[PDB]
Design a binder for this molecule. Structure first.
Ligand SMILES: *[C@@H]1O[C@H](CO)[C@@H](O[C@@H]2O[C@H](CO)[C@@H](O)[C@H](O)[C@H]2NC(C)=O)[C@H](O)[C@H]1NC(C)=O
Ligand SMILES: *[C@@H]1O[C@H](CO)[C@@H](O[C@@H]2O[C@H](CO)[C@@H](O)[C@H](O)[C@H]2NC(C)=O)[C@H](O)[C@H]1NC(C)=O
Ligand code: CLR
Ligand code: CLR
Ligand code: CLR
Ligand code: NAG
Ligand code: MG
Ligand code: MG
Ligand code: NA
Lengths: 32, 291, 996
């Protein structure tokens, strides 16, 4: 039915993105 | 230091005349370009959508269930004697049903007589513009018995034992699906389960359910619901002057001078509900006929 | 009546020291040889107060906490919170089911000030606590003579009018009136600024009770010798006591950074009330009643207040103060970190601040040649040639014929900063032989001393005879030292590369011009000579008792001269050059003799070489000084005797027409008057001192710089900055960081000020066009106090776009922190593109769901209504209350994301004010993380399970993140081409309107 949106996949993708970008930024500030 | 207004060396509000002109000219050019840019992008946005269908329709997944007396708090409080006490209700009922008169639905080129019996759905092709302006099935006031009458300009409604019709939220391409014959305890209803969307009213608790004595439903041919022959909706552009189905509910045995709560819940598979939106699928009303 | 009390202290002190021995004992009622009875001592002990300065006025910790909750900026956030609860009072009592938005904001605005107060208070308190670990208050017992008996008692147990005796090494307790001395030299360094040890003579010498010698002073140490004296003043009534009380009763002034904050608030509130009022009137003209119009006025004015800017500013200043503490340059004030950057006139102290305040061997005369010894404090200079025989012969005269030795624990300490017992001159000689000529320990015992002659009161000469240990000659070695004019009379032979020559006038006058050269350079020169006694006339067994002429006074062999003076610190000359290079006018303010101060000024950079004073021009033309024109003299020496007879206009004239000024012999009060004269010009003044005379100068100055160790405690408490390492180059670092943080502040501010346009425009057109709300309140808090926190802080980590130490100091009347250009950019251009970028995303979301933008006009009437659950869209669909409210909140969330998207480009363009981004470069790792964290946090605030439940922030459909992409790229390209035209056309248009 066209009245349904897979919001769970998009939400899951937004959280994985929010996790990867934060850990990458942490690697950015820890130049060793 | 706050009298920099003017000087004999040319300053106004802080700067000279030639400088005010330069700055004003720059800001006009800057903002004009910004306006043209916002317009160009918003035009691209207008071109990414069609005229016959909204791109996103999931935020209207569960259709609503509204009423005719759009009360300030979904409450119906008036006096069975004072005519001005219930004027705000009747005025809205007459204005709502003003487009349902036999004289309003007179053109045979845009109206089609569906029938006296709720039948299967009527699909008028695809949603494109290859076909002309679709037909809208007629719905005369006579279907809602005891809450229509053949009154004059003012629909003399019910003072005692009032009337409250319900309406299914018009949704484009929405195909109502009534519950299966395997009805999971749906509060005595007629056996016309396949070609009508059921809607049953009730109280809310042990008190409201006892205060409300008898309810009488009225619809197409006498069924408490909406006939499937009027769905789905094809938009306002392709189907202007469309008449969604109506269904009236009258509360005959009411306990006067007592505010009681009524929940008219619409049943079906394609009808969802929500604990945050008391109107998605279901419908609430607080009636109080104080004499 | 404290106005009169401060005035009677700004006056130079007076005295009755000029009295006969009989009259002083009659006035004080005290025996000259027995002091007073202990009962009479305890009577004045319990009469006026113990001999100790009244402790400073204690500052409770709750006082300075409530202080950090107030201010100028926090005051704006306080009045904003008051308007939030006032608007909430109107909205609650007048409409049905009021919303908790405005109250949620009032409690948030209050919390912003409290958190900022706790953080800034923790930083200033942390600064004061480490200062509490620097008070090495060691009680010092004094030697007081009472009832004919000597008694050692606590310093606080001394009273007025009693005999007090001090030993060489003992610190003078209170202000004494010398009655009997014996070669006693006191150290008036920490008080009046006199460098060399000024002897204390019982007879009255000078009218000024300061230059005189019959007065011992509070906080002064007896260098050598011993002396007696009657206590005149005690406690706060002392010299340095009244100076300290003056420093405690002086005003600190208004810092330039705070003046810029106040000037910033004037513009923020000016445009905030302008918009609030214009829209209040526009609202009443449309349809909204007074009830709703007042809420519009307050909401518009309050929303125009930068909420997150207080924390970013406080943290910005904190981040710079951190680097100040890393290099041991502590600042007791969190904002005094910027004060050095705005400095344009430095008033420096000579003795103790510019110089090391320690006698050190400067130059030497050997073989008719001047050799400069390393006078640096860290021994990082050129070493003289130490291979000839004249150097060994001279070094033995100085290392042997001297009354100076090291102490017990002086072993692991450096050769220079170690304690040495004796005269200051003998101390410099010992530290020079122990550093350039090996060691003096085994070298002194190598020559067994037989008969010595100490320094004499007249014809001051010091001589001694020693046994000869060379494995060649058994003749006794006689060494003698003294003033050059006294040794020239007692010599006939001259040493040259080892052999002797007569006293020929060709090289003798060559020694005289060298004497006048090392003397005119402000140094103290001494003559050293030695002679070999004939072992055939004075055998190894003959004892030459110290009575008659056993050694030939004349016909000696002079080796050379040795000059000495307190040298400037290591990084002092280069630092002065760096301050004059940045354009800071350097003016020396000291109380020392002009003969030494003029030379020090020429040697540090205050007086450039070639520039002549009013006196030098007169000496060059052999004409009186009253003939020359003072305009022909670029520099000038101002004597303290003449400064007393001056007005304000004359001091203004001294400071305007003269670029290199040196104030010599100026009393502490005169130092304060000089500081006030420089402030009358409207320029920022920074005073750097060490002694108690610099306390009223460092307190009144916009910023006082005190030495962490070589400076007294009084001037250390009244100053706003402390140099724990005493490295004067820290001043150069302070002015560099002070200007750098000022520019990074301009950037950090324009960043937060740009976001105000897209934060307020939704609510504005909401009232104008009657459209649903494009941006919610919670979503605004997630921008000001959420995402933008890290980019605004990372914007402080920015570096210099050019050479800051090359440009001139800012003008307090011209170059403001927040000028009309920054508003023309943030509020005028950048924030404008950000607001349009937000509205685009708003229309995109609404039009794709079925609510075309053309259909959104006048829709807020039935939109914000909670009961019209059949609101028709452009396609005819009926929307309930929560369905369309779900769309409005999922329309506020992408608006917030839109702000972050445009903030990407806004952070990259505000990162550089003039240079291109490709020129500066994204090397700021905190800024890169500022973008990564901002993005991850923005996505997290939308896609976390329960965001639509707690903050009403629904997840976004992945197509909305690109609705703001072209707007951000537009912001970046427009500002990049803007900075480009500023580069190629630095003339006026693109620079005087956009460059902020
Ligand atoms: C509509 O209203 C009429 C009254 O105007 C109802 O008619 C009554 O019906 C009852 C039976 O239920 C009879 O006993 C009465 O004699 C009728 N009275 C009149 C005046 O007709 C009618 O029942 C209502 N219709 C419905 C469907 O309830
Ligand atoms: C309509 O409601 C009334 C109540 O208002 C019902 O009549 C009551 O019946 C109880 C017994 O259960 C009596 O004690 C009351 O005195 C009655 N009241 C009146 C006014 O008659 C009545 O039965 C209901 N009728 C229908 C058709 O539901
Ligand atoms: C200007 C450029 C270089 C900045 C790089 C960051 C851009 C490319 C990133 C930052 C945030 C990102 C979005 C993050 C969140 C979502 C929801 C997710 O389930 C799909 C990906 C999607 C739709 C991303 C698209 C690309 C995006 C906009
Ligand atoms: C809701 C609508 C009607 C309000 C429209 C407000 C617009 C027209 C106002 C808001 C801020 C204004 C600018 C504010 C800042 C500058 C720089 C200044 O030195 C000259 C005025 C100038 C150039 C203004 C031009 C007009 C401007 C952009
Ligand atoms: C001079 C050039 C570089 C500017 C060209 C403008 C480009 C960058 C702009 C113009 C219109 C914009 C698009 C407008 C329509 C859509 C569909 C929407 O739901 C998401 C935004 C999206 C995907 C935009 C992406 C960026 C876009 C293509
Ligand atoms: C549902 O079942 C009833 C009997 O249980 C039957 O009479 C009726 O026709 C059925 N309806 C449908 C649509 O199957
Ligand atoms: Mg000093
Ligand atoms: Mg803000
Ligand atoms: Na101060």
């Amino acid at each position: 039915d066209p009245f349904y949106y897979d919001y769970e996949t998009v939400r899951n993708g937004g959280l994985i993105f929010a996790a990867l970008a934060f850990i990458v930024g942490l690697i950015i500030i820890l130049s060793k | 230091k706050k009298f920099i207004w003017n000087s004999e060396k040319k300053e106004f509000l802080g700067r000279t005349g030639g400088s005010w002109f330069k700055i004003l000219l720059f800001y006009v050019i800057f903002y004009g370009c910004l306006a043209g840019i916002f317009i160009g992008t918003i035009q691209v946005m207008l071109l990414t959508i069609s005229e016959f269908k909204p791109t996103y329709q999931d935020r209207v997944a569960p259709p609503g269930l509204t009423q005719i007396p759009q009360s300030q708090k979904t409450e119906i409080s008036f006096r069975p004697n004072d005519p001005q006490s219930y004027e705000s209700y009747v005025v809205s009922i007459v204005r709502f049903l003003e487009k349902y008169k036999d004289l309003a639905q007179k053109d045979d080129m845009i109206f089609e007589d569906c029938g006296n019996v709720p039948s299967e759905l009527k699909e008028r092709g695809e949603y494109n513009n290859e076909r002309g302006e679709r037909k809208v099935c007629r719905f005369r006031l006579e279907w809602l018995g005891n809450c229509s009458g053949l009154n004059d300009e003012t629909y003399g409604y019910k003072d005692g034992k009032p009337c409250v019709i319900i309406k299914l939220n018009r949704v484009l391409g929405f195909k109502p699906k009534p519950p299966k014959n395997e009805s999971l305890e749906t509060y005595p209803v007629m056996k016309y389960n396949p070609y009508v969307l059921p809607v049953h009213c009730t109280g809310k608790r042990d008190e409201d359910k006892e205060k409300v004595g008898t309810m009488e439903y009225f619809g197409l041919g006498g069924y408490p619901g909406f006939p499937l022959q009027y769905y789905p909706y094809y938009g306002k552009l392709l189907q202007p002057k469309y008449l969604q189905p109506l269904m009236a509910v009258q509360f005959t045995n009411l306990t006067m001078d007592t505010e009681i709560r009524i929940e008219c819940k619409a049943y079906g598979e394609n009808i969802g509900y929500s604990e945050k939106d008391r109107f998605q699928g279901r419908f609430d009303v607080k009636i109080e006929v104080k004499s | 009546k404290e106005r009169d009390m401060d005035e009677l202290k700004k006056e130079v002190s007076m005295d009755d020291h000029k009295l006969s021995l009989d009259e002083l004992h009659r006035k004080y009622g005290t025996d000259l040889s027995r002091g007073l009875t202990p009962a009479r001592a305890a009577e004045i002990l319990a009469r006026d107060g113990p001999n100790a300065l009244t402790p400073p006025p204690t500052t409770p910790e709750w006082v300075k906490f409530c202080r950090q909750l107030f201010g100028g900026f926090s005051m704006l956030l306080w009045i904003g919170a008051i308007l939030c609860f006032l608007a909430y009072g109107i909205q609650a009592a007048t409409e049905e089911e009021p919303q908790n938005d405005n109250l949620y904001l009032g409690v948030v605005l209050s919390a912003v000030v409290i958190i900022t107060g706790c953080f800034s208070y923790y930083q200033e308190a942390k600064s004061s606590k480490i200062m509490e670990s620097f008070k090495n208050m060691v009680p010092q017992q004094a030697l007081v003579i009472r009832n004919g008996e000597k008694m050692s008692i606590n310093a606080e147990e001394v009273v007025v009018g009693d005999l007090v005796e001090v030993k060489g090494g003992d610190r003078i307790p209170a202000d004494l009136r010398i009655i009997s001395a014996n070669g006693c030299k006191v150290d008036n360094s920490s008080l009046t600024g006199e460098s060399e040890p000024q002897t204390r003579s019982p007879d009255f010498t000078n009218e000024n009770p300061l230059e005189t010698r019959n007065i011992a002073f509070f906080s002064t140490n007896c260098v050598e010798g011993t002396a007696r004296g009657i206590v005149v003043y005690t406690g706060d009534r002392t010299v340095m006591g009244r100076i300290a009380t003056l420093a405690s009763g002086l005003e600190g002034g208004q810092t330039p950074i705070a003046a810029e904050i106040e000037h910033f608030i004037h513009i923020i509130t000016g445009v905030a009330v302008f918009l609030g009022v214009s829209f209040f009137i526009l609202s009443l003209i449309l349809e909204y009643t007074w009830l709703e119009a007042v809420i519009f006025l307050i909401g518009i004015i309050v929303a125009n207040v930068p909420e997150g800017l207080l924390a970013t500013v406080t943290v910005c200043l904190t981040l710079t103060a951190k680097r100040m503490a890393r290099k041991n340059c502590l600042v007791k004030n969190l904002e005094a970190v910027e004060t050095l950057g705005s400095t344009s006139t430095i008033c420096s102290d000579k003795t103790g601040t510019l110089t090391q305040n320690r006698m050190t061997v400067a130059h030497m005369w050997s073989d008719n040649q001047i050799h400069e010894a390393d006078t640096t404090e860290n021994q990082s200079g050129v070493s003289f040639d130490k291979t000839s025989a004249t150097w060994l012969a001279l070094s033995r005269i100085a290392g042997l014929c001297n009354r100076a030795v090291f102490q017990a624990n002086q072993e692991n300490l450096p050769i220079l900063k170690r304690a040495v017992a004796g005269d200051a001159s003998e101390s410099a000689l010992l530290k020079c032989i122990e550093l350039c000529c090996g060691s003096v320990k085994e070298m002194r015992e190598r020559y067994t001393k037989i008969v010595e002659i100490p320094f004499n009161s007249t014809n001051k000469y010091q001589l001694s005879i020693h046994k000869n240990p060379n494995t060649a000659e058994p003749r006794h070695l006689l060494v003698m030292k003294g003033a050059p004019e006294r040794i020239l009379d007692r010599c006939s032979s001259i040493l040259i590369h080892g052999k002797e020559q007569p006293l020929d006038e060709e090289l003798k006058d060559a020694f005289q011009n060298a004497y006048l050269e090392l003397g005119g350079l402000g140094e103290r020169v001494l003559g050293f000579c030695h002679l070999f006694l004939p072992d055939e006339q004075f055998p190894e067994g003959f004892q030459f008792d110290t009575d008659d002429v056993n050694f030939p006074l004349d016909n000696l062999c002079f080796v050379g001269l040795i000059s000495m003076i307190d040298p400037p610190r290591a990084a002092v000359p280069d630092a002065v050059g760096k301050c004059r290079s940045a354009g800071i006018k350097v003016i020396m303010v000291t109380g020392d003799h002009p003969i030494t101060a003029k030379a020090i000024a020429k040697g540090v950079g205050i007086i450039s070489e070639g520039n002549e004073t009013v006196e030098d021009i007169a000496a060059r033309l052999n004409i009186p000084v009253s003939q020359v024109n003072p305009r022909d003299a670029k520099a000038c020496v101002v004597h303290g005797s003449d400064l007393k007879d001056m007005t304000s206009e004359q001091l203004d004239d001294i400071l305007k027409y003269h670029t290199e000024i040196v104030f010599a012999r100026t009393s502490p009060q005169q130092k304060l008057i000089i500081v006030e004269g420089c402030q009358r010009q409207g320029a920022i003044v920074a005073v750097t001192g060490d002694g108690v005379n610099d306390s009223p100068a460092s307190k009144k100055a916009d910023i006082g710089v005190a030495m962490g160790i070589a400076g007294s405690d009084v001037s250390k408490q009244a100053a706003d900055m402390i140099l724990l390492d005493d490295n004067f180059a820290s001043i150069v670092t302070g002015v560099e960081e002070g200007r750098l943080i000022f520019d990074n502040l301009k950037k950090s501010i324009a960043y937060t000020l740009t976001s105000n346009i897209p934060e307020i425009t939704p609510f504005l057109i909401f009232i104008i066009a009657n459209i649903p709300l494009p941006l919610g309140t919670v979503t605004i808090l997630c921008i000001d106090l959420g995402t933008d926190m890290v980019p605004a802080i990372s914007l402080a980590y920015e570096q210099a776009e050019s050479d800051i130490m090359k440009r001139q100091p800012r003008n307090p009347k011209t170059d403001k922190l927040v000028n009309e250009q920054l508003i023309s950019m943030a509020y005028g251009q950048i924030g404008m593109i950000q607001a349009l970028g937000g509205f685009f995303t708003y229309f995109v979301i609404l039009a794709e769901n079925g609510f075309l933008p053309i259909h959104l006009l006048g829709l807020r009437v039935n939109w914000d209504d909670r009961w019209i659950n059949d609101v028709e869209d452009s396609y005819g669909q009926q929307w309930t209350y929560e369905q369309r409210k779900i769309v409005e909140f999922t329309c506020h969330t992408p608006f917030f994301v839109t702000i972050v998207v445009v903030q990407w480009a806004d952070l990259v363009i505000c990162k550089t004010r003039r240079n291109s981004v490709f020129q500066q470069g994204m090397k700021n790792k905190i800024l890169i993380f500022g973008l990564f964290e901002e993005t991850a946090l923005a996505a997290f605030l939308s896609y976390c399970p329960g965001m639509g439940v707690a903050l009403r922030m629904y997840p976004l459909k992945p197509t909305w993140w690109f609705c703001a992409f072209p707007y951000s790229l537009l912001i970046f390209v427009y500002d990049e081409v803007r900075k480009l035209i500023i580069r190629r056309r630095p003339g006026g248009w693109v620079e005087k309107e956009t460059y902020y």
